[PDB]
Amino acid sequence: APAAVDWRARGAVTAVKDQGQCGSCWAFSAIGNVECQWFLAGHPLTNLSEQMLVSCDKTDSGCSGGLMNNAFEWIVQENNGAVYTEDSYPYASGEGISPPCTTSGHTVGATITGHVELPQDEAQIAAWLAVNGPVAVAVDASSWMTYTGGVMTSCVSEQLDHGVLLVGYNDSAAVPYWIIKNSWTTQWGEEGYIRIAKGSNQCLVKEEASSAVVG
Ligand SMILES: *[C@@H](N)CNC(=O)[C@H](Cc1ccccc1)NC(=O)c1ccccc1
């Protein structure tokens, strides 16, 4: 694997979004992954719908929580692999209110055929990310409220509570780090992003890493 990767520089990552006052990070993580994978598949970078998952995906629990794996599963097995555009199915749960599911007239932004899980190994995850793009991961963001910038090194790593997106790493730095996309606006952290120490399983980052498959 390369010494450093940043898929943002490859224009493969969309703008930082805002989940608002809603427990829908799982949806943002999954959808982000699908966005990046769709671009890297040879298609235009399209903003996709988190609201599709929050409202329609009943395997998960809307604004109270859910799982990225469950989202990919639901997309393939229930929604024929379709991921709608954010433009034709916009996010509306910003204040905590989830509209009902609508299945007439929406526009398919991406089409996935499956998903893969990555080993609980930062090296193997990086090895994947360097080739096939950004990875949906679960973390312990309990100590993230106070993050303002820099490489976090003593992140509270107890129990998973947040869904974020690995978009790259840097093994060349004095302290090697993961570059992580969050869904807490651009005011938080490093322009919406956060760098965490790589190799010491910070925030339990290596626990649940998955990626969609765009056949
Ligand atoms: C983010 N603000 C919403 N939080 C959750 O959805 C929360 C944490 C989470 C971790 C990994 C992947 C997705 C979400 N959900 C859970 O703790 C959880 C666990 C088991 C079943 C449902 C929800």
Residue numbers in the entry: 1 to 215
Quote the study on this structure.
Chagas disease is caused by the protozoan parasite Trypanosoma cruzi, which is transmitted by blood-sucking reduviid bugs of the subfamily Triatominae. The human enzymes most closely related to cruzain are the cathepsins, in particular cathepsin L, and these have been targeted using the nitrile ‘warhead’ to form a covalent bond with the catalytic cysteine in a reversible manner.
Nitrile-based cysteine protease inhibitors targeted at rhodesain have also been shown to inhibit cruzain and a library of cathepsin inhibitors has been used as a source of antiparasitic leads.
